[PDB]
Design a protein around this ligand. Structure first.
Ligand SMILES: Nc1ncnc2c1ncn2[C@@H]1O[C@H](COP(=O)(O)OP(=O)(O)NP(=O)(O)O)[C@@H](O)[C@H]1O
Ligand SMILES: [Mg+2]
Lengths: 279, 282
């Protein structure tokens, strides 16, 4: 408990978070811990707060790592507090909802998809340079701002029965091989397909059949290949190479020509407006 | 929306009014009482609805008793009977069972299956992890999330449902299949009881699917250690030809079951498993 506490108390701030924040509202769904949205009473900034507390954790190290390493395209650590038999971690939050609501209720054009893909690749290049693998690049984990900001958020037994379909997972992942950061590039490709088709792949499959198809055939079958520009199709091909060596890195894909048709992020705000109206 | 209203409509809206057993996935499980009772909580589909409805409508002494359910939006609760003897997995994984103890478990499982199959229900997820044990050596089946309800109208399924290592070949290859898929899975559970693990467990789940699809009837590591009668029972459970494979009704009459010991013979296995688990944690 010594090492554990002391490191906290270096970084954790003094004060009562109960007075610094108002308008708490549950949204998680912790584990691990419970996650609320709330508002800074001094600045009006809206934040997300996770309250938790404990077998052990890297918690302190991640916390330390994320306080030292921030990036505009991820939701960043803001502050932390030890509150009684609890720990509170305060992180950034955005009010424009998830990419999956946009994907579900609108039809994105290639310029908008390129804008999103570019923001995500900026997050991924950053994370990968810090030896972090997200592992869950999917529309549910992309948060949008009212100004069109884009941030990544939220970053097994063989005997267990599979419940959800792990549609975003790379072949090397589903076949339980050793794997690296490029699994995130695969999931990005899947997410780009989701944006253009308006729903994730494998929707009509059992988890096991989907698992088999991913391992065996790799990329899902494009429902309507004719509809995509050559340059978008090239970008997808680069993301969804089954051979990890041939698959692009985040750094390389940042240079891809598809990203150069990206609209300004302001082009996403009409999509957020549609999605909120729809929901 | 529709499915969640359906779920809502099954649920009791009464006052549940908090010991812990262990936290699984989908979601985490807990102990309690009000008669000793076991309660599950989860906070999000049809699998839940199916499980609840199928359990409600198919009560039987060899099936874990469903009691009630209460939903709180957010989280959802399912209340079942508590079996304090743990799972058959703890036993096969930490102890050696004799043929008499194995026959006893097989008999009880076959009783559950004959009942389910007679009610047009296929379990599709038979494995030691889904067999729970009472402190008196009771043997009960759970986990009805993946069960299929068949009809003369539609008597077969073709979907890859189950857990790879226990799935029958006709299931993994997406052929039209029926209740006897459960008999295959029971045979694999018998292999767990002999060897500690189902075949191919060291392989990744997809490798296992391929091996099942290609190998068919799995081979024992040491067939010579088995009695001829036990070996015959296994052969009948794991026949590639569905027609030749035994039904639950048929296998209940098999000579292997005649050597079953009293269910009391299982409590020393439970004790050993408990002690082993304690060993593992320290
Ligand atoms: N009615 C019950 N009585 C006693 N123990 C139970 C009961 N139901 C579940 N358990 C146990 O409580 C734990 C619950 O976790 P759980 O996820 O339900 O099992 P698990 O199957 O091995 N994980 P999963 O593969 O996702 O189902 C397990 O260890 C079970 O053995
Ligand atoms: Mg189970």
């Amino acid at each position: 408990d010594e090492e554990i506490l002391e490191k906290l108390r270096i970084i954790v701030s003094v004060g009562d978070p109960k007075k610094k924040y108002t308008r708490f509202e549950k949204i998680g769904q912790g584990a691990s811990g419970t996650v609320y949205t709330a508002m800074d009473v001094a600045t009006g900034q809206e934040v997300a707060i996770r309250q938790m507390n404990p077998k052990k954790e890297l918690i302190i190290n991640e916390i330390l790592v994320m306080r030292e390493n921030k990036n505009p395209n991820i939701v960043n650590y803001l502050d932390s507090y030890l509150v009684g038999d609890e720990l509170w971690v305060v992180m950034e939050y955005l009010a424009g909802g998830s990419l999956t609501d946009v994907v579900t209720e609108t039809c994105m054009d290639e310029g908008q998809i390129a804008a999103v893909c570019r923001e995500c690749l900026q997050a991924l290049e950053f994370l990968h340079s810090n030896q972090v693998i997200h592992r869950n690049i999917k529309s549910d984990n992309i948060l949008l701002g009212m100004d069109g900001s884009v941030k990544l958020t939220d970053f097994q037994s063989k005997r267990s029965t599979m419940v959800g379909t792990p549609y975003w997972m790379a072949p090397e992942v589903v076949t339980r091989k050793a794997y690296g950061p490029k699994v995130d590039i695969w999931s990005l490709g899947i997410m780009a397909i989701e944006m253009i088709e308006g729903e994730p792949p494998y929707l009509n499959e059992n988890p096991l059949r989907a698992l088999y198809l991913i391992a065996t055939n790799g990329t899902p079958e494009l429902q309507n290949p004719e509809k995509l520009s050559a340059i978008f199709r090239d970008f997808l091909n680069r993301c969804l190479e089954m051979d990890v060596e041939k698959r692009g890195s985040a750094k390389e894909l940042i240079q891809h020509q598809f990203l150069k048709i990206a609209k300004p992020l302001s082009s996403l705000t009409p999509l957020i407006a549609a999605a909120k109206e729809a929901t």
